[PDB]
RNA sequence: UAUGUUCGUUA
RNA sequence: AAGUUAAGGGAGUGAAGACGAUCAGAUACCGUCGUAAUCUUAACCAUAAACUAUGCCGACUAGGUGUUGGAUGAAGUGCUUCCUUCAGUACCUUAUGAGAAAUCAAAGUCUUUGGGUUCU
RNA sequence: UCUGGUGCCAGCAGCCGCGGUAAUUCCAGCUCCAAUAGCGUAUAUUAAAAUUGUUGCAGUUAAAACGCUCGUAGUUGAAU
C-alpha cells in the first residue's frame, strides 16, 4: 500500500513545533494533529497521524532521522563529558 | 618545542599503509620489513604548519570549509571548524555546491580542506571549477590530482586523523594572536576523537 | 637535476658518465701468500702462481670464487 | 586588454577562463611566530594541478623562498 | 536591475566593487551570472555596446516511440567589436526560449581577444599577433596576421565572429567539415581565446600577483 | 640509425618544455647542436646549457625557463637563397615580429633577420618560438 | 569495430594455437579461445551419498570425485548460460 | 537446444 | 588449409555420392554409411579475416599490477625471498596528448604541419 | 506563403527537389531582385581542390601496409 511522499514530508513538518505538546497515547497525537495542522481531508488528517506515532514509536530506541530540538543537547554534553625499531631508529635519527 | 613534540609521538601517524604510490617518495623514508610503510614525521611537522600559515591568511575564516566523508573524520573536522573560524561539511558531499548556484545550500569557500582525498574526490574534482586551492590530508597512496599541500599523515586511522586535525587548529591558533606559544595546551585529543 | 646526481652507482651500466661494473683485485690464499692479479667477471679458469690451486670458477658474472682467500680491489 | 598572470612554476601564462589554476597565499611570522597582515603570493597553473605534480612544484617554489627548508 | 544578493562574484559586481573586466579574467574567476554584464555593459552610461545575433538555428529531433521530438539548437555570437566576444549554445523547445538561452550562455561565455597590433604602437591593434589555430570537431581554422587594408579574408562565419571580436584584418584557412557551422563556429571561438595564452616574448617579464578580488573584499563580504 | 643528431636535440628540447621540466638532456651532443643552443641562448630562449664532456661524444644538459612554443629541425636543410627569405619566413615563423628560422651560412649558423643584414642566404637548419 | 582489445582470445607473441574441440557440438575452436570449465562434480546427490555410505563397507568409504574438464565453443557456451552477454562496461571486468 | 515462409509501388 | 603429380599408407574424420529423416518442397541443417582428401616421401601450387585489418629503423613523453629469461646487491632456512637493472611479453589508470568517434602509451610528440625510408 | 490556369499532365529543375485542387518551384499577370548596353547557355580550362598534397592529404575500423624475410639500384646516414 505504501505512503506518498506528500503525506510523508506533511508528516516530517510537524513534531519539530511542539515536541512539548506531542505525548505518548495514540488518541492524543491524534487529536494534536488536527488541532495544529491544516489539511481539508478528514482520511489525510487521521492517515498522517498515522504515520507521525509510526515515527514516535521508533523514539527512544535510536535514531530517527530528524527533530533537532532540546532534547538532543543534554546526550551530547553527557557524551562529552618501545615502538617499532624503523620508527625508534627515525626518533634516534632526527633527535 | 620539546613537549609539542612529546604530544603527537603516541598516536598512529607515522604508519601509512601499502600500495607505494609514486609522488610520495620525498613523504616516505622506507617500507616496513612487514610492507607497511612509514612517514617522515620530519615533514609531516612542517607541512601541517604551513598549511595552517597559509589557512590563517584567509581573512575571514569562514571561507575556508572542511570536508570529511568518514565518520571517525566527521567530529575531528567539525571540532576543527567549530574551534577555529572556519567551516565544514561532513559525511555525504551533493556533488553540487561548488558550481551549482542555484541549488539551496551552495556556500562555495575561497579555501578547501580534505580529509581524504580518494575518499571525497568529488570536492577535490569540484575545487577546480571555481579555482578553489585544497589542502588535504594525504596518506601513503592517497591521489594527488588538483591537490597543492598535501599533509603526508595517516588517513584511516581515528586517532590519526583527530590528531592531525587538532594540532592543525592548535598551529592556526598559535599563529593568530589567540594564545601564546609558550605554555602548553589545555585542549585534549579525545575532545577531538571519534566517540 | 641530472648534473650533480650522486646515486648513479646503483643505476644502470652507460648512465650519465658510462662505467664498467667490473674492477681487479688481488688474492691472497691463507696459507700461500701469493701475489696475481684477477679480473672481477673473468671469463676463464685462473690458477696461482706460488702454489696451483684452482682460484675462481667463471660465470655470467662476478664468478664463484673460493671458500677462502683474501681478495682486495686493485683500485687507487 | 590586460596581461595575464603567469603559473610561477611552469611560467606559462594562465588564460581566462582556466578555473583550475589556484593563486596560493602564505604568511609570515614574527619573532614570536604569529601571522602578521602581510603575504606573499603564489600562482600555480591547472595543467600542473591536473596532472598532480602542484604539491612538489609548490615545495620547490617555497624553498626557493625559504618558507620551508627540507627541499624534496 | 533589482536582483536579491546571494553569491558573492555577483554581489561584489553589483555594488560596483569591480571597476572592470580585467581582473576577473587575470584570476581566471568563473562568470556564473548574466549580472555580471547586466550591471557592466549597460545601455546608457557605457563605453561601447554588445551586438547579440543568432548565427545559426538547427532542429534536431530525438525520435521517441510516438513521434519525433524536435526542439531546436539556437548558436549566437555576442561580441563588443574592441577585444571582447563570445558564443553560445542552447536546445529548447521552442525557438524563442532557445535565442534567449543561447544569449545567456554566450554572454557569460565572454573572453578576451588579444588584438595584435602589426606596425605601430601608436596605430590600435587590427589584426591577430600571431598565427593562431582553433579545432572542433574535424573542421581546423587558421587565423594569419594580415595588413591594415585588409578585410577579414574568411568565410561569412569567420567575418561576422571576428567582427564581434574586433579584428578587421586576418586572413583565414580552414580544413575540414566546415558546413557543421556548429563546429565551425567552436572552431573559430576557440582560435580567438587562444589568442591571450600563447606566452609571446613581450610577456616574459615577470609581474607580481595582485590581489584576488575575493581576498581584497573579503571584509565587504562579511557585515552580511 | 639517428640521421639527424640536431633533430633528435630540438625533439628532446620540445617535449620537455612541453612537460614543463625545466631540466633536459640531450645524449648526442654536436657542435652543430651547441651553436643551435647558444644561439637560442643569445635570443633568450633557453638559460645556462652545459656540454658534459667525456670520451663518447658527450652530453649536454640545458635548463628551461618555460620560454619556447615550439623549436624544430627543417629537413632536408634546402638551400635557401637572400631572395626567398620572406617566401620561407611567411610560411614558417608565426608572427613577423618575434621566432627565428635558423640558416647555416657561408658565415656559420644565424637567424633569417641578421643572415639578411649580412646577406649571404644559405641552408636552411631549423627554427624555434 | 573492435568489441573486444584481445579480440575475443587470448593470443599474444603467438601466431597459431591448436584448435581443440567443443564438448557440446564438436566444433573447432582455438584452444585460447575456448571457454573452458573444469568440472569436479560428486558421482552422484547428496541423497544418494547418504544411502551408498550407509549401504557401503568399511564404513568410512568416500565417494571418489569426477573430473570432467569441459570446453564449449562460444555458442554453445552460451546458450548452456555458461557465459551471459554482459553490459559495455561490466564487459571488461574479469573477476 | 523438433517445424514455422511471405508482406507489390509511391508519397 | 585446400588443390595437382607419383609412390606408400589408409584407423578415425569425411568435399562427392547413396540412403533415412524433417519440411509445402529440403537437392540443406539432423542421422547411418561412404569416395577423394586428410598422414609419409619426392615434386608443384603461392593463396587466407596469411589480422594486432596497425610496414621497417631511430628519438622523446607516465604511473601501477603482473609475468618470461639473464645479471647485481641484500636476508629466514649450503638452501629459500627481496632490491636494482637489461631484454621480452601482457594488463589497468591517466591524459590542458590524439582522434569523427569507437578508441590509442601509440593510432602521442601534426595548420606550433619536415628524423630516415619503402609500399598503397 | 500575391492573383489566375493546369492538376503526377504539361512542364520546371546544374544539386536537394516541385507538380495528384491553397503549386511561394510549371504556364501567365503584377510586384520584386540581380547584373546592365549588356545578360544567358554549351564545352574546355584555372581557383575552389590540403579531392594529386614539395610546401601539403590519407592508409586499425571510411579507399588504402606487400604473407613474411633477404636483397641490388635508389634514397638516407653517429661524434671528432
Known amino acids: 500500500r505504501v505512503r506518498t511522499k506528500t503525506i510523508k514530508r506533511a508528516a516530517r513538518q510537524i513534531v519539530e513545533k511542539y515536541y512539548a505538546k506531542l505525548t505518548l497515547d495514540f488518541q492524543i497525537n491524534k487529536k494534536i494533529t488536527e488541532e495544529v495542522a491544516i489539511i481539508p481531508s478528514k482520511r489525510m488528517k487521521n492517515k498522517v497521524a498515522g504515520f507521525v506515532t509510526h515515527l514516535m514509536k521508533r523514539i527512544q530506541k535510536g535514531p530517527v532521522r530528524g527533530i533537532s530540538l532540546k532534547l538532543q543537547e543534554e546526550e551530547r554534553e553527557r557524551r562529552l563529558d618501545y615502538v617499532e625499531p624503523d620508527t625508534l631508529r627515525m626518533i634516534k635519527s632526527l633527535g | 618545542k620539546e613537549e609539542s613534540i612529546a604530544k603527537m609521538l603516541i598516536c598512529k601517524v607515522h604508519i601509512g599503509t601499502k600500495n607505494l604510490e609514486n609522488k610520495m617518495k620525498r613523504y616516505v623514508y622506507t617500507r616496513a620489513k612487514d610492507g607497511v610503510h612509514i612517514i617522515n614525521l620530519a615533514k609531516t611537522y612542517e607541512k601541517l604548519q604551513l598549511a595552517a600559515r597559509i589557512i590563517v591568511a584567509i581573512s575571514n575564516p569562514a571561507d575556508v570549509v572542511v570536508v570529511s566523508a568518514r565518520p571517525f573524520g566527521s567530529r575531528a573536522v567539525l571540532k576543527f571548524a567549530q574551534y577555529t573560524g572556519a567551516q565544514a561539511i561532513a559525511g555525504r558531499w551533493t556533488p553540487g555546491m561548488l558550481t551549482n548556484q542555484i541549488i539551496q545550500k551552495f556556500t562555495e569557500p575561497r579555501l578547501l580542506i580534505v580529509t581524504d582525498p580518494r575518499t571525497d574526490a568529488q570536492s577535490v574534482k569540484e575545487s577546480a571549477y571555481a579555482n578553489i586551492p585544497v589542502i588535504a590530508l594525504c596518506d601513503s597512496d592517497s591521489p594527488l590530482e588538483h591537490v597543492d599541500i598535501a599533509i603526508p599523515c595517516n588517513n584511516k586511522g581515528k586517532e590519526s586523523i583527530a590528531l592531525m586535525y587538532w594540532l592543525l587548529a592548535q598551529e592556526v591558533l598559535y599563529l593568530k594572536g589567540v594564545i601564546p606559544r609558550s605554555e602548553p595546551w589545555n585542549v585534549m585529543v579525545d575532545m577531538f576523537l571519534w566517540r | 637535476n641530472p648534473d650533480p646526481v650522486e646515486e648513479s652507482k646503483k643505476h644502470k651500466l652507460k648512465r650519465l658518465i658510462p662505467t664498467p ?14 701475489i696475481t692479479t684477477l679480473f672481477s667477471h673473468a671469463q676463464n679458469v685462473v690458477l696461482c702462481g706460488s702454489c696451483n690451486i684452482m682460484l675462481c670458477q667463471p660465470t655470467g658474472g662476478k664468478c664463484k670464487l673460493t671458500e677462502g682467500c683474501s681478495f682486495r680491489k686493485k683500485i687507487e | 586588454i590586460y596581461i595575464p598572470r603567469k603559473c610561477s612554476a ?5 588564460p581566462a577562463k582556466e578555473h583550475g589554476a589556484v593563486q596560493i597565499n602564505v604568511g609570515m611570522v614574527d619573532a614570536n611566530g604569529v601571522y602578521n597582515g602581510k603575504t606573499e603570493t603564489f600562482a ?14 609548490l615545495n620547490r617554489l617555497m624553498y626557493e623562498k625559504k618558507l620551508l627548508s627540507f627541499q624534496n | 536591475k533589482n536582483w536579491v544578493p546571494v553569491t558573492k562574484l555577483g554581489r561584489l559586481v553589483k555594488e560596483g566593487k569591480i571597476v572592470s573586466i580585467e581582473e576577473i579574467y587575470l584570476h581566471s574567476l568563473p562568470i ?9 555593459f549597460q545601455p546608457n552610461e557605457c563605453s561601447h555596446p554588445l551586438k547579440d545575433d543568432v548565427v545559426k538555428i538547427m532542429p534536431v529531433q530525438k525520435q521517441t516511440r510516438a513521434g519525433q521530438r524536435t526542439r531546436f539548437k539556437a548558436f549566437v555570437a555576442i561580441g563588443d567589436g574592441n577585444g571582447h566576444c563570445g558564443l553560445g549554445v542552447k536546445c529548447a523547445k521552442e525557438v524563442a526560449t532557445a535565442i534567449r538561452g543561447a544569449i545567456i ?16 604602437k601608436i596605430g590600435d591593434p587590427h589584426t591577430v599577433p600571431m598565427k593562431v589555430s582553433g579545432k572542433c570537431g574535424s573542421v581546423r581554422i587558421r587565423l594569419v596576421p594580415a595588413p591594415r587594408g585588409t578585410q577579414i579574408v574568411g568565410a561569412p562565419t569567420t567575418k561576422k565572429m571576428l567582427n564581434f571580436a574586433g579584428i578587421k584584418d586576418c586572413f583565414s584557412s580552414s580544413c575540414g567539415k566546415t558546413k557543421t557551422k556548429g563546429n565551425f563556429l567552436r572552431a573559430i571561438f576557440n582560435a580567438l581565446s587562444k589568442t591571450y595564452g600563447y606566452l609571446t616574448p613581450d610577456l616574459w617579464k615577470v609581474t607580481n600577483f595582485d590581489k584576488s578580488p575575493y581576498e581584497e573584499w573579503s571584509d565587504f563580504l562579511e557585515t552580511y | 640509425v639517428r640521421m639527424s643528431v640536431l633533430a633528435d636535440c630540438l625533439k628532446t628540447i620540445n617535449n620537455a618544455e612541453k612537460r614543463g621540466r625545466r631540466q633536459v638532456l640531450i645524449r648526442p651532443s654536436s657542435k652543430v647542436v651547441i651553436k643551435f643552443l647558444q644561439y637560442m641562448q643569445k635570443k633568450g630562449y633557453i638559460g645556462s646549457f652545459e656540454i658534459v664532456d667525456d670520451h663518447r661524444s658527450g652530453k649536454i644538459v640545458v635548463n628551461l625557463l618555460g620560454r619556447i612554443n615550439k623549436c624544430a629541425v627543417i629537413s632536408p636543410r634546402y638551400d635557401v637563397k637572400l631572395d626567398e627569405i620572406e617566401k620561407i619566413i611567411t610560411s614558417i615563423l608565426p608572427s613577423r615580429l618575434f621566432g627565428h628560422l635558423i640558416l647555416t651560412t657561408p658565415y656559420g649558423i644565424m637567424d633569417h633577420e641578421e643572415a639578411r643584414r649580412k646577406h649571404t642566404g644559405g641552408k636552411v637548419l631549423g627554427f624555434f618560438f | 569495430p573492435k568489441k573486444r582489445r584481445n579480440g575475443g582470445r587470448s593470443k599474444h607473441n603467438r601466431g597459431h594455437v591448436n584448435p581443440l574441440r567443443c564438448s557440446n557440438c564438436g566444433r573447432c575452436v582455438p584452444k585460447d579461445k575456448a571457454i573452458k570449465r573444469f568440472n569436479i562434480r560428486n558421482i552422484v546427490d547428496t541423497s544418494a551419498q547418504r544411502d551408498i555410505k550407509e549401504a557401503s563397507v568399511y564404513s568410512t568409504f568416500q565417494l571418489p570425485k569426477l573430473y570432467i574438464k569441459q570446453c564449449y565453443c562460444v555458442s554453445c557456451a552460451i546458450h548452456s548460460r555458461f557465459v551471459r552477454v554482459r553490459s559495455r562496461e561490466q564487459r571488461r571486468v574479469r573477476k
Open chain 3, 21 to 34: 661494473n667490473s674492477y681487479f683485485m688481488d688474492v691472497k690464499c691463507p696459507g700461500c701468500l701469493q
Open chain 4, 10 to 14: 611552469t611560467s606559462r601564462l594562465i
Open chain 4, 44 to 57: 600555480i597553473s591547472g595543467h600542473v594541478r591536473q596532472n598532480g605534480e602542484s604539491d612538489a612544484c
Open chain 5, 32 to 40: 556564473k551570472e548574466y549580472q555580471i554584464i547586466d550591471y557592466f
Open chain 5, 105 to 120: 550562455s554566450a554572454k557569460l561565455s565572454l573572453i578576451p581577444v588579444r588584438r595584435g597590433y602589426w606596425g605601430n
